[PDB]
Amino acid sequence: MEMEKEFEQIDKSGSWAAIYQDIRHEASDFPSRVAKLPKNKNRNRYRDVSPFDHSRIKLHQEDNDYINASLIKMEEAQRSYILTQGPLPNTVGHFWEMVWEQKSRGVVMLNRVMEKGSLKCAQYWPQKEEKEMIFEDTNLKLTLISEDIKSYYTVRQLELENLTTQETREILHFHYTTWPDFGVPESPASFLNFLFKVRESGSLSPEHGPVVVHCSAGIGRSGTFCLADTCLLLMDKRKDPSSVDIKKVLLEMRKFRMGLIQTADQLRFSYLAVIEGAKFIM
Numbered sequence: 231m232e233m234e235k236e237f238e239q240i241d242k243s244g245s246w247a248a249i250y251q252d253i254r255h256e257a258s259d260f261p262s263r264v265a266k267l268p269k270n271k272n273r274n275r276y277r278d279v280s281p282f283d284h285s286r287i288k289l290h291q292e293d294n295d296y297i298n299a300s301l302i303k304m305e306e307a308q309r310s311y312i313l314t315q316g317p318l319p320n321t322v323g324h325f326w327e328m329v330w331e332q333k334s335r336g337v338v339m340l341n342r343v344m345e346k347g348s349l350k351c352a353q354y355w356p357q358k359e360e361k362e363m364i365f366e367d368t369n370l371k372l373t374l375i376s377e378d379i380k381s382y383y384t385v386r387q388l389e390l391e392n393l394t395t396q397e398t399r400e401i402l403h404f405h406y407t408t409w410p411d412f413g414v415p416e417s418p419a420s421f422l423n424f425l426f427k428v429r430e431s432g433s434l435s436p437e438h439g440p441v442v443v444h445c446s447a448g449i450g451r452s453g454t455f456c457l458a459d460t461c462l463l464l465m466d467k468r469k470d471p472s473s474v475d476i477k478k479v480l481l482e483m484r485k486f487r488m489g490l491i492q493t494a495d496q497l498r499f500s501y502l503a504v505i506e507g508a509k510f511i512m
């Protein structure tokens with residue numbers, strides 16, 4: 231079926247939970263043996279969210295190459311994304327090592343450091359120009375260059391330096407600051423505006439390594455971001471935009487990381503975002 235009318239048909243029939251459970255039943259199951267080794271227990275935020283072995287990002291380190299992060303490679307859309315958990319106190323250095331080694335231009339953050347009175351990820355970037363951060367375990371230096379605070383999101387320019395080689399690179403930090411502590415946004419308008427700002431920067435484009443995107447577990451809000459982006463790109467590329475099937479795209483993405491889209495409300499919000507976004511594109 232088309233999307234917008236499939237949408238109203240699920241609303242009128244109130245069957246979002248049944249649709250979402252079908253997706254969960256059909257989703258791929260692949261091994262995640264490296265994630266479950268005992269030496270990696272303090273590298274995982276949640277015991278039930280792990281990268282598959284076949285698609286995990288490997289750190290270029292011979293001691294321990296493990297990080298909780300996955301490469302989502304979308305062949306028809308010609309887009310790649312790295313989805314990862316919010317860094318932990320003992321993985322902030324690994325996180326920036328991955329950004330360096332994978333040649334990423336942008337980092338997309340969809341959570342606040344504290345939500346619901348608890349810490350959802352480490353404070354992993356510097357908050358003042360004159361107070362830089364040094365990660366001694368991976369030999370990197372990170373400096374805040376500039377910060378632009380808007381009503382729904384903040385964009386930061388950062389300098390990442392590899393202290394071994396003295397090479398430097400400019401990284402863009404796109405921080406969506408207004409996702410609610412509970413539920414999903416009422417309108418997709420500010421989320422779509424944010425996605426378009428990431429696109430305009432070049433961070434999603436083939437001349438760079440894959441964008442790094444995260445929330446707390448790296449599957450819920452993070453899944454909504456890449457699902458909407460890929461669906462809109464396919465609607466531009468195909469002769470028949472109504473052929474784009476958001477459930478099929480989501481199942482394709484779940485071949486590469488488990489659990490993408492965590493609730494039926496996130497599924498409905500993803501439909502809404504793609505529907506509204508397709509009208510603005512034209």
Ligand SMILES: Fc1ccc(Cn2cnc3ccccc32)cc1
Nearest residue numbers: 419422423425426462507510511
């Ligand atoms: F991936 C995308 C492709 C195009 C747009 C177009 N757009 C830009 N700003 C918007 C605000 C509200 C609604 C739509 C919008 C967005 C995302």
